[PDB]
Design a protein around this ligand. Structure first.
Ligand SMILES: Nc1ncnc2c1ncn2[C@@H]1O[C@H](COP(=O)(O)OP(=O)(O)OP(=O)(O)O)[C@@H](O)[C@H]1O
Ligand SMILES: Nc1ncnc2c1ncn2[C@@H]1O[C@H](COP(=O)(O)OP(=O)(O)O)[C@@H](O)[C@H]1O
Ligand code: VO4
Lengths: 130, 942, 740
């Protein structure tokens, strides 16, 4: 329902020419739905996250079934990027290997000692110029 | 309220004359609404079966008084076996009723619509005339079968003439009546007889008529007559066994329990037309036969357990209690209950109970059962909430109170309404103890029902009989071989979540064996002839049903067991080349790899052929295998191949169950307005059933691509079992059309109960089925087409360059296996890494296109292109197989790539490869040259 | 005592009697408080003794020696060790059937103590020597304190009408807590009918039972109408509201409110505080069960039409009581804890009435051999009582009882309800005609009910009695870093658990053998489990050394391992329910050691050494796979098919680790014995061609179960019996075979 409200708010066009398609108002522009902490959503009593299943369905099959008319809605100019944490982090739960297939994973670690030194060294030299 | 009346007061012409004063005074609110509801309930009370029909359907039916043809759809759900009614040429006089299998029951006395114009009255009369016609035809059939009862060496021709003369239920009834009368007469003649044994004549008569049937089933027979014969052997073999038991136990008088325990029938047409000629009797339990056209349905092989079940249900009905069969799944509970409800010839309705059945729904169902007197089998009753089980304990105590009041037109309290109760009522609740998604029953309700343990069905006799009936001359040996084979397969094989070796498995095997035998008879005749090898037919059926679900380490075990139980014979896969050429064509059209046997893409073709086999056998299918095993493509390519091979279109609706709430999946029923809104699956099923756009002529394939858990799939237990029926809390019953397959593409069945595993033919898509070279070839084929003409050429020659690196044991495969040997934050999935790699190579082609566009003169040449692509491929391997890992894992993958490659690499010895990018000209440039040491402004820092 | 016992379990009545006896003792005049003796009684096991144990004349076990040396701490008990070894009849007293009746005088007292002093002395001696008879001795002590027939009211069936009309105020609800399998709705419905008072019975739920209940309560407070709310434990919040409303209504007199509910901890405490609580259970002992059944059956229904009806009803009640209170000894009696309840007895009564009325129309004094014995036996074994029976062994036990009781010979004079209760004393069939004769015969039943009445062995109550005594003492007494430890335990476990075992070589000739395939699968599964558990324990060791980080899986494993709960991942093979981690680890070590022996044997010989080896079925992942593999190997050795094979077992393939539960085998025949278990050394599994021949009378089918909990049948063995034994006795005694 969170994603449905997000699409209703920003992707007003629910047009259905020769098929129901979902597109944002700003024509010629794509849309990136930045989903943060995607692996926090709890799984059901039977180990299955609902929103993860929804994303897999609307990414692999490229659309969903709206509950208003039970009609297939196809995504237009919509893409998803998620931000999550290692599974061993307490409070975190792994995703289904079925969802992972459509999404490549990139591992961003904490900046190293020299990296932190140079990154914040530029900040300190900018600040002390006052 | 007001909107309801506004919507419903502007319909057809005569539909508005149904108490039209409200219609005129509309074009206050509570009075009008309650008057309309009172009219609806009055019409429902006039004809009790109207408590099964919807209010809108009833109102349209009354509005469609002149048109009767449009009313020929509700008969399927009003009655049990009635699906059509035969009218006169002028659409004015109904002559009889037709079942959905094409069987006619011509009324002895026709009734005219003009001679009773009101819908309810003429419907009541046609019901009564149907019962009267069944009674009269049963009397005639009993009179006819008297001749076979008092004759030896019976004539097969006249015997078949009798069999196809009358309806199937009447034939079985006549057989049972004749046997009961003969055994009773023999026992009476013996009395206290020291040595008189005239019942051996009865046994010999059963033997000879059974031999006549066995001879008659071995040859070509018409379909309806074939089913009648099958039923008749199933009953007569039980009669033979009962008579042998009586002879062995040496019963003298007809009052002994060894004869009283077995069901016996008593016919006397002397009494009046109150339809009490039949007096079916179990042990001290007298039952009438509520004559109603059941049509033609399957008959179970009355086994030792199926008898005990009959005894306990009859005793419970005598005590006016209910029956609560319990035990493991697929042990003959809903089918034994139904078979007994049809032995007494009474309308039985099966409801699949779930937590959405609220109190008012149960009350409405019980009111319908009161008015009609029809039985009720509530499948999976414990699936209701415990609170609701307690709540309906009150209604069970009220309904049983009305039956106990009959013992002293009875009314019982059911939803602040007093309803007529008929003694033929029955309430049955099948349940699965100790199963996931099941709630415990209160003791208050558990004392209102009588329970028996249907734990282990007698599958040996179940097989031997169903075979003997098919035409297998060595049915005894076949069953003696196959049942121990099943019990040893259950133990020897490794335990898996999708493994089912119960009665539902044996049943599917024996049905397939019968179909295979019929097909082999046809094939032989295309070139009496009963020297077939039956063992190889059984092996073919087993291998066409059991094999498609074995894991790669279990097939040798099953084949060894088969070769040990059946030593000397073996089966070879059917060629099915007429389908395989179509599969090759459509795979070529879909950039998917095709093979045969040990070729590349051969195991996947074997699995799609097995999926076709399971589609032919079962009506519910289930694909089990690790994600990325080719499950989705298997059924897509099969559907596209069948829509050309057979010419019938195939439309597939893919529904994700867990994506949406099960309220949206099936439907909702608001407790206030009492209005039903179809869910997702229900809407699709209603569209299919109502073939307005020819949906019944298309190969509809509903697929549930998601996760199976014992909450939603349990609502489908009635659609995936022999019932082929969807039962809703509204009371609506939607039959599954024969051209519909319910499929479930899952990765594992760990969170699933044996009930759903028992149905839905399993197809196990192992991970080795989709080989990595097939995925590579799919990519290269998609790259050599599908322009992301100039851009297409840029993709073509790039694919030509990358072809040597995608060998089965090429660079990419070795890098992938080494990456699987490393450690990643998330578990490494092959198709994820391959998808990222393919996306990045597509981006490499876009970079080439961008560069070619940027330099219209001096276009980017072949040597530069091959250098750039062969370096970008290494870059992509490193950033796909180790983009999810920590830095030293990336370095390890880089070192492995360096030592197992021939592509030129950066020459620096210390800095890892990942720190290098690939320039558009094709040089391994460092990334530390694109990190300017910038100076942030003195403001806006951080 | 009576008022509290009306609403508390039958296990806890003895503790309440003990506490009341203590209160009476402290309220006496001059007799000593015996505080030290009670202190030693309540906590005698708490005293620590390292190596002071010393057996005497080999008459005391390790536990008995520890108990006597612990009890020697009491000053009057300084001479126990020397006195017990100086006595000869003490040995006879130790193994006596009922040592509570006569306890030899061993304690040294300067002055003769009061009879209560002798009673408590005997109680201490019984606790020290015969913990099984601790309940009986506590009963005797309560009798000596509060007088005989003090807690005899609990045996009498509860009188609902008097308690409801006198001891219950209208405001206070009547709470009928019911154990699973029992419901109090029927009894109170009968009460309401007997009082000829209209009553509103409502089941709680569906959000409409609340409104109906509120309306009924509102109407009933101004009219005296009774009200029932059934299964009121599913709406605790509405039950809070009900308590709040019920606290202030000042209702009409003779008004009552009944709340039927189960025993679950989710019921409010305040409601339990504000209402009278009644607990309904299976009555204790056969005597009370007969009494309850006879009270339940109306007097008019009995002694109507033939005089044999009363004897039929008495036989029915005896059968019902026997099967009802065999359920207490579930592992050795009925394999599963069934729910033989009140509906079963009502249906039995209805069928008996109907069939007796059918077989005898009006005429009285029907001949005993004309009663439909077969009809009643079949209806009771297949439709009423056998309906709830799942497995075939319990069904055959039910058939055994029904055929033993429901027979014409039961109307004789020397018919025995129980074959033997003391080896010489046999329960005799009461020669009664009218109901009161059988009722008074029930009332003169002795109070020495042993399990030998049931057909179960006489020594089938030792463990249960000792457990109940320990629980009674614990209840009476209650009435009055982890990181380093986990480090040490993980290190010890890794030490005791052996290293990874080697697989079996896949050759072209060994792959075909069924035995080799089975052993390969076994060792492969064992190696997978061993690797998983070893890496998990190593990870735990590394984390407890502090170098490694915390994972969700590791956190769960640590949390469930510090508590002694076996990890679910390690639960791959069939195990008895609810053991500690240490026992599972020892079992796993033994299993892996046996698997290593199997691997070595296979290495010595690919096929020739895979047949002549002995396998303990207790340690094995799938024993039925082993049985099927042996069957398949024998079938493949000859030309015989799998089906034409039957299993014959000769106790000396070789199989070890089996134990008989109450049977001693001389050569291959069986003789009933009183021993709890008898080891089976090196049983041989021989498969021979099936002859389709009915077995002899002496041949019986004994189930073989994996562990003590008879919940997983492996296979069945047809054993022959020695001379002058009855297979019926074997079946009724619950003889079986256990792998563990
Ligand atoms: N015969 C084939 N030849 C080439 N590629 C194939 C073939 N079969 C499947 N593939 C490829 O395999 C990949 C995964 O196939 P598919 O989606 O059918 O797997 P799946 O097991 O159904 O996945 P999921 O469980 O995630 O839905 C796709 O890239 C598909 O094109
Ligand atoms: N006696 C029998 N003879 C033949 N088939 C039987 C017999 N008993 C059960 N079956 C079949 O076994 C399956 C059991 O289905 P069902 O009774 O619905 O299962 P459940 O016991 O879970 O309710 C069906 O295919 C049914 O036709
Ligand atoms: O007991 V079931 O008919 O839901 O398999």
């Amino acid at each position: 329902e969170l994603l449905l409200k997000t699409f209703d708010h920003y992707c007003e066009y629910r047009r259905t020419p020769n098929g129901v398609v979902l597109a944002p108002v700003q024509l010629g522009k794509w849309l990136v739905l930045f989903c943060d902490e995607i692996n926090l959503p709890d799984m059901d009593k039977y180990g299955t996250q609902r929103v993860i299943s929804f994303i897999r369905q609307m990414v692999e099959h490229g659309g969903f079934y709206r509950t208003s008319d039970q009609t297939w809605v196809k995504l237009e100019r919509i893409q998803f990027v998620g931000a999550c944490n290692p599974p061993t982090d307490p409070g975190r739960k792994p995703l289904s290997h079925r969802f992972l297939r459509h999404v490549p994973v990139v591992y961003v670690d904490y900046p190293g000692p020299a990296s932190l030194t140079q990154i914040y060294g530029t900040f300190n030299r900018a600040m002390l110029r006052l | 309220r007001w909107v309801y009346l506004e919507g419903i007061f502007t319909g057809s012409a005569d539909i508005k004359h149904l108490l039209p004063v409200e219609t005129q005074r509309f074009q206050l609110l509570g009075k009008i609404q309650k008057a309309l509801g009172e009219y609806l309930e009055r019409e429902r009370s006039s004809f009790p079966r109207f408590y099964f029909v919807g209010d809108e359907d009833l109102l349209e039916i009354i509005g469609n008084s002149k048109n009767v043809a449009k009313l020929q759809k509700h008969f399927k759900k009003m009655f049990a076996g009635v699906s059509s009614i035969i009218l006169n040429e002028d659409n004015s006089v109904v002559l009889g009723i037709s079942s959905r299998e094409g069987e006619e029951v011509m009324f002895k006395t026709p009734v005219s619509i003009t001679e009773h114009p009101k819908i309810n009255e003429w419907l009541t009369l046609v019901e009564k005339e149907m019962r009267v016609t069944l009674a009269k035809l049963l009397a005639e059939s009993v009179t006819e079968v008297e001749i076979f009862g008092k004759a030896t060496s019976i004539d097969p021709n006249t015997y078949i003439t009798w069999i196809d003369k009358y309806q199937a239920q009447l034939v079985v009834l006549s057989a049972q009546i004749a046997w009961s009368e003969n055994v009773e007469t023999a026992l009476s003649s013996m009395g206290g007889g020291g040595d008189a044994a005239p019942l051996h004549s009865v046994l010999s008569n059963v033997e000879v008529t059974l031999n006549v049937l066995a001879d008659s089933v071995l040859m070509e027979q018409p379909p309806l007559r074939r089913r009648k014969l099958e039923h008749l052997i199933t009953e007569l073999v039980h009669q033979r066994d009962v008579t042998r038991s009586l002879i062995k136990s040496k019963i003298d008088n007809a009052k002994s329990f060894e004869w009283l325990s077995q069901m016996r029938f008593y016919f006397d047409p002397k009494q009046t037309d109150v339809l009490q000629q039949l007096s079916i009797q179990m042990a001290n339990a007298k039952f009438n036969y509520g004559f109603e056209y059941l049509g033609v349905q399957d008959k179970l092989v009355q086994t030792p357990l199926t008898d005990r079940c009959y005894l306990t249900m009859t005793q419970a009905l005598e005590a006016r209690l209910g029956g609560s069969p319990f035990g493991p799944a697929g042990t003959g509970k809903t089918e034994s209950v139904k078979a007994l409800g049809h032995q007494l010839g009474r309308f039985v309705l099966v409801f699949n109970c779930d937590e959405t059945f609220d109190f008012q729904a149960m009350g409405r169902i019980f009111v319908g059962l009161c008015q009609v007197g029809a039985w009720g089998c509530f499948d999976e009753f414990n699936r209701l909430e415990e609170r609701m089980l307690s709540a309906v304990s009150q209604q069970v105590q009220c309904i049983q109170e009305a039956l106990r009041e009959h013992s002293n037109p009875i009314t019982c309290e059911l939803l602040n309404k007093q309803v007529k109760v008929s003694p033929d009522m029955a309430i049955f609740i099948t349940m699965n103890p100790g199963y996931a998604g099941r709630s415990n029953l209160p003791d208050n309700l558990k004392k209102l029902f009588r329970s028996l343990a249907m734990t282990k069905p007698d599958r040996q006799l179940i097989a031997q009989v169903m075979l003997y009936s098919q035409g297998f001359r060595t049915a005894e040996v076949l069953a003696n071989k196959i049942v121990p084979f099943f019990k040893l397969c259950d133990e020897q094989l490794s335990s898996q979540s999708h493994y089912d070796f119960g009665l539902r498995a044996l049943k599917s095997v024996l049905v397939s064996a019968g179909n295979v035998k019929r097909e082999r008879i046809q094939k032989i005749k295309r070139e009496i002839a009963e020297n077939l090898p039956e063992q190889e037919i059984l092996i073919q059926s087993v291998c066409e049903t059991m094999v498609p679900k074995l894991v790669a380490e279990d097939i040798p075990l099953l084949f060894s067991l088969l070769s040990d139980v059946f030593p000397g014979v073996q089966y070879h896969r059917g060629e099915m080349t007429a389908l395989r050429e179509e599969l090759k064509k459509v795979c070529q059209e879909m950039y998917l790899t095709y093979g045969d046997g040990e070729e590349v893409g051969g195991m996947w073709v074997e699995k799609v052929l097995q999926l076709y086999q399971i589609t032919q056998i079962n009506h519910g299918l289930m694909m089990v295998g690790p994600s990325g095993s080719g499950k989705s493509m298997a059924w897509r390519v099969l559907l596209k191949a069948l829509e050309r091979l057979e010419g019938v279109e195939g439309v597939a609706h893919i529904i994700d169950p867990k994506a949406i709430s099960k309220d949206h999946l099936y439907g909702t029923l608001d407790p206030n307005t009492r209005e039903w809104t179809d869910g997702l699956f229900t809407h699709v099923l209603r569209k299919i059933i109502d073939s307005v756009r020819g949906e019944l002529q298309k190969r509809q394939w509903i697929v549930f691509d998601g996760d199976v858990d014992p909450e939603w799939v349990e609502n489908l237990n009635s659609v995936l079992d022999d019932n082929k029926l969807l039962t809703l809390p509204n009371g609506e019953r939607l039959s599954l059309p024969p051209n519909v397959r319910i499929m479930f593409e899952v990765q594992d069945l760990k969170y699933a109960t044996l009930a759903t595993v028992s149905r839905c033919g399993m197809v196990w898509f192992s991970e080795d089925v989709l080989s990595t070279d097939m995925i590579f070839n799919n990519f290269l084929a998609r790259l050599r087409s599908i322009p992301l003409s100039p851009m297409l050429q840029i993709q073509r020659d790039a694919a030509t360059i990358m072809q040597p690196y995608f060998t089965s044991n090429g660079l990419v495969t070795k890098a992938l296996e080494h990456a699987f040997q490393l450690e990643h934050i998330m578990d490494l999935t092959r198709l994820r890494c391959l998808g990222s790699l393919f996306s990045m190579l597509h981006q490499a082609c876009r970079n080439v296109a961008q560069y070619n566009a940027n330099h219209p003169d001096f276009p980017m040449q072949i040597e530069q292109l091959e250098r750039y692509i062969q370096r970008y491929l290494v870059y992509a391997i490193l950033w796909s197989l180790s983009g999810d890992s920590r830095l030293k894992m990336r370095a390890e993958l880089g070192e492995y790539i360096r030592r197992i490659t021939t592509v030129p690499l950066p020459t620096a010895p210390n800095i890892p490869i990942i720190d290098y990018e690939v320039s558009i000209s094709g040089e391994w440039s460092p990334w530390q040259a694109k990190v300017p040491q910038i100076e942030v402004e003195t403001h806006k820092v951080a | 005592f009576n008022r509290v016992a009306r609403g508390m379990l039958h296990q806890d009545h003895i503790t309440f009697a003990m506490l009341l006896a203590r209160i009476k003792l402290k309220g006496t005049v001059g007799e000593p408080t015996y505080d030290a003796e009670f202190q030693h009684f309540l906590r005698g096991n708490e005293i620590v003794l390292s190596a002071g144990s010393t057996p005497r004349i080999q008459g005391l076990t390790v536990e008995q020696a520890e108990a006597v040396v612990r009890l020697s701490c009491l000053p009057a008990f300084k001479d126990l060790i020397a006195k017990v070894q100086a006595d000869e009849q003490f040995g006879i007293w130790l193994d006596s059937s009922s040592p509570e009746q006569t306890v030899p005088y061993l304690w040294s007292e300067e002055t003769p103590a009061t009879p209560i002093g002798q009673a408590i002395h005997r109680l201490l001696l019984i606790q020290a020597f015969r913990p099984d008879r601790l309940l009986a001795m506590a009963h005797m002590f309560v009798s000596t304190n509060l007088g005989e027939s003090f807690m005899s009211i609990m045996e009498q069936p509860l009188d609902l009408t008097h308690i409801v009309g006198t001891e219950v105020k209208p405001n206070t609800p009547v709470l009928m807590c019911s154990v699973p399998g029992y419901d109090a709705s029927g009894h109170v419905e009968d009460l309401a009918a007997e009082q000829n008072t209209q009553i509103t019975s409502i089941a709680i739920g569906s959000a409409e039972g609340f409104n109906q209940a509120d309306k009924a309560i509102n109407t009933a407070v101004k009219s005296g109408r009774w009200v029932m709310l059934k299964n009121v434990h599913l709406a605790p919040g509405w039950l809070m509201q009900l308590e709040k409303k019920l606290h202030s209504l000042q209702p009409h007199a003779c008004f009552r409110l009944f709340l039927t509910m189960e025993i679950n901890p989710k019921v409010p405490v305040n409601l339990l505080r504000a209402g009278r609580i009644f607990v309904f259970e299976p009555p204790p002992g056969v005597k009370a069960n007969m009494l309850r059944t006879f009270s339940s059956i109306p007097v008019s229904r009995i002694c109507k039409s033939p005089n044999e009806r009363a004897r039929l009803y008495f036989l029915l009640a005896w059968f019902h009581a026997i099967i009802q209170e065999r359920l207490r000894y579930a592992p050795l009696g009925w394999s599963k804890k069934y729910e033989f309840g009140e509906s079963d007895l009502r249906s039995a009564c209805d069928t008996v009435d109907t069939w007796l009325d059918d077989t005898a129309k009006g005429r009285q004094n029907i001949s005993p051999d004309k009663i439909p014995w077969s009809a009643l036996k079949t209806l009771m074994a297949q439709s009423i009582y056998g309906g709830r029976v799942d497995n075939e062994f319990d069904q055959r036990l039910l058939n055994t009882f029904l055929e033993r009781l429901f027979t014409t010979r039961s109307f004789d004079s020397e018919f025995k309800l129980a074959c033997k209760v003391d080896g010489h004393k046999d329960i005799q069939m009461p020669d009664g005609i009218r109901r009161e004769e059988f009722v008074q015969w029930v009332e003169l039943l002795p109070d020495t009910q042993t399990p030998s009445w049931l057909g179960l062995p006489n020594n089938a109550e030792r463990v249960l009695l000792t457990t109940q005594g320990v629980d009674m003492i614990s209840k009476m007494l209650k009435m009055q870093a982890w990181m380093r430890t986990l480090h040490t335990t993980a290190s010890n476990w890794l030490h005791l658990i052996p290293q990874t075992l080697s697989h079996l070589k896949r050759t072209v000739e060994n792959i075909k053998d069924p035995l080799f395939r089975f052993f390969e699968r076994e060792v492969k599964m064992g190696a997978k489990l061993l690797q998983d558990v070893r890496q998990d324990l190593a990870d735990v060791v590394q984390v407890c050394e502090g170098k490694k980080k915390q994972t969700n899986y590791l956190r769960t494993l640590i949390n469930e391992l510090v508590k002694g709960i076996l990890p679910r991942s390690w639960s791959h093979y069939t195990v008895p329910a609810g053991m500690t981690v240490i026992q599972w680890v020892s079992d796993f070590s033994e299993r892996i050691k046996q698997l290593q022996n199997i691997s070595l044997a296979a290495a010595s010989g690919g096929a020739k050494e895979l047949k002549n080896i002995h396998v303990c079925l207790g340690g094995l992942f799938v024993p039925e796979a082993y049985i099927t593999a042996t069957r398949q190997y024998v079938a493949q050795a000859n030309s015989w098919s799998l089906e034409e094979l039957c299993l014959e077992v000769n106790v000396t393939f070789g199989v070890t680790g089996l134990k008989l539960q109450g049977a001693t085998c001389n050569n291959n025949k069986l003789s009933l014995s009183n021993a709890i278990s008898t080891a089976l050394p090196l049983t041989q599994l021989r498969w021979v061609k099936q002859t389709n021949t009915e077995k002899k009378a002496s041949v019986v089918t004994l189930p073989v179960y994996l562990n003590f909990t008879r919940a997983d049948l492996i296979f069945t063995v047809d054993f022959e019996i020695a001379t002058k034994e009855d297979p019926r006795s074997f079946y009724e005694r619950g003889v079986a075979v256990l792998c563990t």
